[PDB]
């Protein structure tokens, strides 16, 4: 019965291992969702920039004509 501290240790470490694996799955899912969102925000910014640069040059050529 002295070796019963050994049994509680196995049970505690089992839960610790499950927690470690669950945190790694959660981190992977968090980072993937974060990447997806950041990729979307990058595309929108690149789109807004492209439209703004077009409008900038349009106005520049209107002004040069007057």
């Amino acid at each position: 019965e002295e070796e019963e501290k050994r049994r509680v240790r196995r049970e505690r470490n089992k839960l610790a291992a499950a927690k470690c694996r669950n945190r790694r799955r959660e981190l992977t899912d968090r980072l993937q969702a974060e990447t997806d969102q950041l990729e979307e925000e990058k595309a929108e910014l690149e789109s807004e920039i492209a439209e703004l640069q077009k409008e900038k040059e349009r106005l520049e050529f209107v002004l040069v004509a007057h």
């Binding site: 980072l31 993937q32 990447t35 950041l38 925000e41 990058k42 910014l45 920039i49 900038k56 106005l59």
Partner: protein, 67 residues
């Protein structure tokens, strides 16, 4: 015995597969952490370019409208 050699070879094969499996998990995380850091940096730069262009556009609409 052949039973022992076979059981040991299976453990070797599985130890190889486990190390490869674990490595791919950590490499996916490492790859994703880098991409997140890069995208945050790039989007900050893009946001500042957009902000400037918006002001430049605003002023040009004023120069045009003043005619």
């Amino acid at each position: 015995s052949q039973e022992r050699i076979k059981a040991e070879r299976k453990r070797l094969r599985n130890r190889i597969a486990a190390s490869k499996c674990r490595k791919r998990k950590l490499e996916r995380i490492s790859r994703l952490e880098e991409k997140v850091k890069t995208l945050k940096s790039q989007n900050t730069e893009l946001a500042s370019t957009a902000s400037l262009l918006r002001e430049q556009v605003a002023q040009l609409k004023q120069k045009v409208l003043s005619h």
